[PDB]
Amino acid sequence: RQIVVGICSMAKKSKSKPMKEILERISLFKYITVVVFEEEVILNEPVENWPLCDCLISFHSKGFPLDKAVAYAKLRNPFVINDLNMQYLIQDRREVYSILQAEGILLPRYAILNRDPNNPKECNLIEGEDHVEVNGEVFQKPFVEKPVSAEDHNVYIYYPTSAGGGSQRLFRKIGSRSSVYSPESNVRKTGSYIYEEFMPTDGTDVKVYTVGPDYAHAEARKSPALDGKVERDSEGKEVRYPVILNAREKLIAWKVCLAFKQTVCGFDLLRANGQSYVCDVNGFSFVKNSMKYYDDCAKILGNIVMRELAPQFHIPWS
Ligand SMILES: O=P(O)(O)CP(=O)(O)O[C@@H]1[C@@H](OP(=O)(O)O)[C@H](OP(=O)(O)CP(=O)(O)O)[C@H](OP(=O)(O)O)[C@H](OP(=O)(O)O)[C@H]1OP(=O)(O)O
Ligand SMILES: Nc1ncnc2c1ncn2[C@@H]1O[C@H](COP(=O)(O)OP(=O)(O)O)[C@@H](O)[C@H]1O
Ligand SMILES: [Mg+2]
Ligand SMILES: [Mg+2]
Ligand SMILES: [Mg+2]
Ligand SMILES: [Mg+2]
Ligand SMILES: [Mg+2]
């Protein structure tokens, strides 16, 4: 009997180039068969009708019925690569930051402003022209304002008077741009936000991609917060810069992977003030346009599957 690896995610993810490149490589494992769950089945069929698997790779993105994935895993009890219940928490920046703190992982100093939907101005935010006070905690500009929903990428940065004031409004890339300047200096007045201290980097973000706690690919890209113009290469892809993680950062990746129980895990690091701060944990994410990552990721995942399941299948594995 072949060991079945089931892939359960939205078609946009399951049919992405990185996914296809990696699944083709996992399929090279002699005793592993890959089954990709059709999106129509995921959305419209009860979990009792979903394909069987022995190892489940499943992850939430927009429109994914996480409730069904959880029910499926409870019904079939497969070996789960990326924990499903943790994926509820990953959708909430407050829950993400709570986990990071609990694990002794450096992150920006932050405060949560929750607005009870029924009451607009019954909250504890005091605003000055160059600072905010959130539940009594002071944040001098520059500071960062993030929607509590991790799926909401409308992150704002507020400039001090000394730099001309106003704000930088980040958003999901639309064409050539990832942010825009706004003359608006006052914070958003509806919704719930995390406020945090701006960490000064060299103008790049470090993107980290784990495959288990002992493997992490990192690369850097221009921070959207600089001017907002996306750097693109001749082929039209966003420019990336080489990164090698130092010992502290490799430990960070180990902690993030295990703490969130996401074997495959993407997160952001800000290299600032001689340290590295996690500002975002996204969960399941593959590196794009790296053949070597495809090779490495497929090999590691296949090895994890074999290590875990080969005994019960009576397959030799050393
Ligand atoms: O390159 P194109 O414009 O064709 C697509 P884009 O580059 O916007 O891809 C983003 C990706 O952004 P990044 O460039 O890796 O920062 C996201 O990554 P971020 O979460 O922004 C990683 P970051 O937080 O910037 O480090 C995440 O990609 P993935 O990681 O899920 O593959 C998104 O997927 P989703 O969040 O919309 O489901 C995906 O958007 P989509 O492909 O759906 O249009
Ligand atoms: N505390 C911070 N200090 C400086 N820059 C930040 C901070 N938080 C976020 N940023 C910048 O804003 C970008 C988006 O923030 P992030 O928390 O990664 O949100 P998203 O989940 O939308 O990716 C980051 O890639 C980084 O460039
Ligand atoms: Mg095979
Ligand atoms: Mg995601
Ligand atoms: Mg992004
Ligand atoms: Mg991010
Ligand atoms: Mg994010």
Curated annotation (Swiss-Prot):
Predominant location: cytoplasm
Modified-residue entries (Phosphoserine), positions: S182
GO cellular component terms, A-Z: cytosol
Effect of K207A: Loss of enzyme activity
Keywords: ATP-binding, Cytoplasm, Deafness, Disease variant, Hearing, Kinase, Non-syndromic deafness, Nucleotide-binding, Phosphoprotein, Transferase
MF annotations from Gene Ontology: 5-diphosphoinositol pentakisphosphate 1-kinase activity; ATP binding; diphosphoinositol pentakisphosphate kinase activity; inositol hexakisphosphate 1-kinase activity; inositol hexakisphosphate 5-kinase activity; inositol hexakisphosphate kinase activity; inositol-1,3,4,5,6-pentakisphosphate kinase activity
Keyword Transmembrane among UniProt keywords: no
Region forming the signal peptide: none
Cellular location(s): Cytoplasm, Cytosol
Outcome when changing R221A: Reduces enzyme activity by about 99%
Ligand binding (substrate): K12, K13, R172, K173, K207, R221, S285, F286, V287, K288
Keyword Thylakoid among UniProt keywords: no
UniProt GO BP: inositol metabolic process; inositol phosphate biosynthetic process; inositol phosphate metabolic process; sensory perception of sound
Binding annotation for ATP: 93, 146, 153, 172, 196-199, 205-207, 223, 268, 280-282
Entry's disease: Deafness, autosomal recessive, 100: A form of non-syndromic, sensorineural deafness characterized by prelingual hearing impairment. Sensorineural deafness results from damage to the neural receptors of the inner ear, the nerve pathways to the brain, or the area of the brain that receives sound information.
Domain topic, free-text comment: The C-terminal acid phosphatase-like domain binds PtdIns(3,4,5)P3 and InsP6. Despite its similarity with the phosphatase domain of histidine acid phosphatases, it has no phosphatase activity.
The protein's role, per its UniProt record: Bifunctional inositol kinase that acts in concert with the IP6K kinases IP6K1, IP6K2 and IP6K3 to synthesize the diphosphate group-containing inositol pyrophosphates diphosphoinositol pentakisphosphate, PP-InsP5, and bis-diphosphoinositol tetrakisphosphate, (PP)2-InsP4. PP-InsP5 and (PP)2-InsP4, also respectively called InsP7 and InsP8, regulate a variety of cellular processes, including apoptosis, vesicle trafficking, cytoskeletal dynamics, exocytosis, insulin signaling and neutrophil activation.
Family, similarity comment: Belongs to the histidine acid phosphatase family. VIP1 subfamily.
Designated name of the protein: Inositol hexakisphosphate and diphosphoinositol-pentakisphosphate kinase 2
Source species taxonomy: Eukaryota, Metazoa, Chordata, Craniata, Vertebrata
The gene coding this protein: PPIP5K2
